[PDB]
């Protein structure tokens, strides 16, 4: 069908290990956002090029069983532009770029607090996976050689931030 256009939306998981903002450790995982979870948005125009826009956060303990107590990644929204190449019938390597908005209650010990507020631009990469025709997989990354912050600063894990999710598109008006 005429359906080149395709709208997609998907929810994640993501973990965010980051020592470069911190207080020097030896073994400690230092971390800016820890972890999180998020929902998105997004579509295509056909494999060539496509969008997704979202919030990755942390609803305090989205386990809802009590609340974290502050500090938590309260919001944020990620508005981007993306590329997916299939590499077999199965995945593609994945990547996007745009902007990004963030907030965080920054109730915490002062100054022993967390980041409260940001704009700035964004990106991500990785793979995006087929699961059924309608139903889909990723996993995206975002990393820099880190100025992390320890003991012997040559020793940091050089690993960036991570995400994983499932997807699902839009049907109807649709044909082989």
Aim: net charge negative; no cysteine.
């Amino acid at each position: 069908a005429p359906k080149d256009n395709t709208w997609y939306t998907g929810a994640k998981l993501g973990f965010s290990q980051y020592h470069d903002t911190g207080f020097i450790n030896n073994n400690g995982p230092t971390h800016e956002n820890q972890l999180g979870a998020g929902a998105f948005g997004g579509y295509q125009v056909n494999p060539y090029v496509g969008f997704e826009m979202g919030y990755d956060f942390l609803g305090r303990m989205p386990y809802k069983g009590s609340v974290e107590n502050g500090a938590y990644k309260a919001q944020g929204v990620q508005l981007t532009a993306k590329l997916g190449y299939p590499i077999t019938d199965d995945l593609d390597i994945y990547t996007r770029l745009g902007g990004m908005v963030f907030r965080a209650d920054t109730k915490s010990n002062v100054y022993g607090k967390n980041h409260d507020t940001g704009v700035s631009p964004v990106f991500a990469g990785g793979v995006e996976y087929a699961i059924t025709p309608e139903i889909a997989t990723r996993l995206e990354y975002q990393f820099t050689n880190n100025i992390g912050d320890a003991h012997t600063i040559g020793t940091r894990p050089d690993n960036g931030m991570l995400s994983l999710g499932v997807s699902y598109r839009f049907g109807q008006g649709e044909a082989a």
